[model samples]
Target: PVEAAIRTKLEEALSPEVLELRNESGGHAVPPGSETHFRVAVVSSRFEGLSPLQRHRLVHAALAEELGGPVHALAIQARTPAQWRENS
Candidate 1:
């Protein structure tokens, strides 16, 4: 499934301490069980020195294949460990 594939790729690339991913396709016009739209919160030390835009791009690169193919929309919450602590 796309969700599982996304989680695997994210874990491998970002090693995020917190990776909350949701499939939001149900709210769209797609069929049930669609894997097009997603919302992901990625918290990792890897994001420590990166800007928000860079962080999102990093994730975008990680999922480039999916983004070019099955995945249509992505909402990203990219944060460092420290930022996540503050937000949490």
Candidate 2:
């Protein structure tokens, strides 16, 4: 599943303390069980000092093949560990 793949990739790359991912392509024209759209909140030290735009690009790059192939929409809430602690 793309959800699992996404999680695995993020885990390897970011070492996130908190990671939440939701598949939101239910009503889209994609096939059943397809993971075409997602909302993700990732908390990791890797995001420190990075702007949201940069984070967006990083996530996209990290999942480049998935993004270009099956994934259609990605909504990201990227945060540093400190920021996640504050928000948690």
Candidate 3:
């Protein structure tokens, strides 16, 4: 359900080539039965030419509605295919 929520939000904004959402809240300080922290890997053309902060802002904007609703901490790895290739 958390993954679905994240995918739905990201898809609406960026239409990514790849998206991976992982829940990593098991060791967090959240209350019992809570799901908040996450690690998100997103590959999208939308990230082209954007700085790291900008990319993160885009994601934050996309998930603004869900920020406090379901997500508390999000660790993101966002990159364009070109960037990925360059890094390789």
Candidate 4:
């Protein structure tokens, strides 16, 4: 599944402290369990020194294959450990 693959790639690249990925394709015109639209929240120490644009860019680069093809919409919440704790 695309979501599983996405998780693997993200974990491999970022080793995030917290990772949440929700597939929202069912809310769209696609069939049930589609992998077209998604929202991901990633909390990692790697984002500590990066700007928002840079963080999102890292995610964008990590999922380049999926984004270039099946993934049409991706809402990202790329955050550092401290930010995640505060948000929580």
Q: Highest lDDT, which number?
A: 3
State TM-scores per candidate.
0.73, 0.74, 0.71, 0.72
Query: Which lDDT value does model 2 have at 34?
Result: 79
TM-score of candidate 4 to 2 decimals = 0.72
lDDT per residue as tens, model 1, 11-80: 7666778777777777877776677887777777888777788867876777666433567877777777
Q: Which is better, 2 or 3, measured by lDDT?
A: 3
lDDT of 1: 0.72
lDDT of 4: 0.73
The segments of candidate 3 whose C-alpha lies over 4 angstroms from its true place after superposition are 28-33, 61-63, 66-69, 85-88
Relative to the true structure, how large is the alpha-carbon lDDT of every model? 0.72, 0.73, 0.74, 0.73
Model 2, stretches more than 4 Å misplaced? Answer: 61-63, 66-69
Better of 3 and 4 by lDDT: 3
Clashing pairs in 1: none
Candidate 1: Cα lDDT at 56: 77
| Residue lDDT tens for model 4, 1-88 | 6777777776776677888778777777787657787777777888877789986887678766643346777777777788777865
Candidate order by decreasing lDDT: 3, 4, 2, 1
Candidate 4 off by > 4 Å = 31-33, 61-63, 66-70
